[PDB]
Write a structure and sequence with these properties.
The structure is cut from a larger assembly and holds chains A (318 residues) and B (67 residues). With 318 residues, chain A is mostly helical. Chain A has 17 helices and no strands. Chain B is built from 2 helices and no strands. Classes of the chains: A mainly alpha (318), B mainly alpha (67). At the A-B interface, loops of A face α1 and α2 of B. Chain B: It is found in: Mitochondrion inner membrane; Nucleus.
């Protein structure tokens, strides 16, 4: 029945990414002093069944000027590498056990931006043309900030797999010891996935609407359901790579219970920001990475290398 | 002969500006901070120095049998 363990995953998650869109504007509602979608629910909890159905009734135009062969294979992705990445992710028991799999995320973190470059180019001119070009450029310069500061800690835990990374955070919430890094693990995923303070990719201010501009109701649910299938995953990751829970070979169930009451707090962070801060004006946006974020990330790497060796600490792995 | 201004008495309420309160300033931070980071590593160097002590124990059974 291994095929019914899968399809029990893909389906029950599409409800979260659906019902996030509701808690989008309730939480961001009371920052403003008001209430959130209310009239339709009664509580509102019934809103997203009505919204999923307005789009696919609503007619899906294509530009007369487009290349239809690319205008499909691209979105036929924004929903794969979002739903594949979930596969080897322990909670506690991952569906797959990949030997070195931690590295496998970067494989699928790196291969999504090659679905932006298609779509914005697939269609047409300068609002999605050079406007989907220069959100490529920022999306690849926030990896080098990443793979390093992912690679740092992994000196402090011994291997590439995720079954060890529950063992080492036992009674030490891995955020003490590298708290300088942890910050930069946060501003990255918020800068890379195109969210609030570095917002430019999806346009509001700097342009009209980035990269979404062409898709009518028909395809544009996918992206608007793809872009929220990354955001609740990196943030359902960070908390396996920092704030660890305590496995329990007996009541596995109490592992996940206490696990979603963390990863679900953590997420409610990209909403708790977006009410707050303004945007960066694309110069300042990269111009603050090389100069500023990076020099440290190298420097710390020269540090977490020696700290095990200089304490006879060296973590028990191959 | 019903008009507005009261007989006497008012505020004012000021227009002034103050909202500066801290908050562990001026090197008080960099003091607690570097103090936590250490107790992080001291919490390592022991777990990680214990876990190896089990590591050898595990490779022991392998060599024990396998004649």
């Amino acid at each position: 029945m291994f095929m019914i363990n899968i399809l029990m995953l893909i389906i029950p998650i599409l409800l979260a990414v659906a019902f996030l869109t509701l808690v989008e504007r309730k939480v961001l509602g009371y920052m403003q002093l008001r209430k959130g979608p209310n009239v339709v629910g009664p509580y509102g909890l019934l809103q997203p069944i009505a919204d999923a159905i307005k789009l696919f009734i609503k007619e899906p135009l294509r530009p007369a000027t487009s290349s239809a062969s690319m205008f499909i294979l691209a979105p036929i992705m924004a929903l794969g590498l979002a739903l594949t990445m979930w596969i080897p992710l322990p909670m506690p028991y991952p569906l797959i056990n990949m030997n070195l799999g931690v590295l496998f995320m970067l494989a699928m973190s790196s291969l999504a931006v090659y679905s932006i470059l298609w779509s914005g180019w697939a269609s047409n001119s300068k609002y999605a043309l050079i406007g989907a070009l220069r959100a490529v450029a920022q999306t690849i310069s926030y990896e080098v900030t990443l793979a390093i500061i992912l690679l740092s800690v992994l000196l402090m835990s011994g291997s590439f797999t995720l079954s060890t990374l529950i063992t080492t955070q036992e009674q030490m919430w891995l955020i003490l010891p590298a708290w300088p890094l942890a910050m930069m693990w946060f501003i990255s995923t918020l800068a890379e996935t195109n969210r609030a303070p570095f917002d430019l990719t999806e346009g509001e201010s700097e342009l009209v609407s980035g990269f979404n501009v062409e898709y009518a109701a028909g395809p544009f649910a996918l992206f608007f359901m793809a872009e929220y299938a990354n955001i609740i995953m990196m943030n359902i990751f960070t908390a396996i790579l920092f704030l660890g829970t305590s496995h329990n070979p007996h009541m596995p169930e109490l592992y996940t219970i206490n696990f979603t009451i963390k990863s679900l707090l953590l997420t409610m962070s990209f909403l708790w920001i977006r009410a707050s801060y303004p945007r960066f004006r694309y110069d300042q946006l990269m111009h603050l990475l090389w100069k500023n974020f990076l020099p440290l990330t190298l420097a710390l790497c020269m540090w977490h290398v020696s700290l095990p060796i200089l304490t006879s600490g060296i973590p028990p792995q191959t | 002969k019903q008009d507005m201004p009261p007989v006497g008495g008012y505020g004012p309420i000021d227009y002034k500006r103050n909202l500066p309160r801290r908050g562990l300033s001026g090197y008080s931070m960099f003091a607690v901070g570097i103090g936590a980071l250490l107790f992080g590593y001291w919490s390592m160097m022991k777990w990680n120095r214990e876990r190896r002590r089990l590591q050898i124990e595990d490779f022991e059974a392998r060599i024990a049998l396998m004649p």
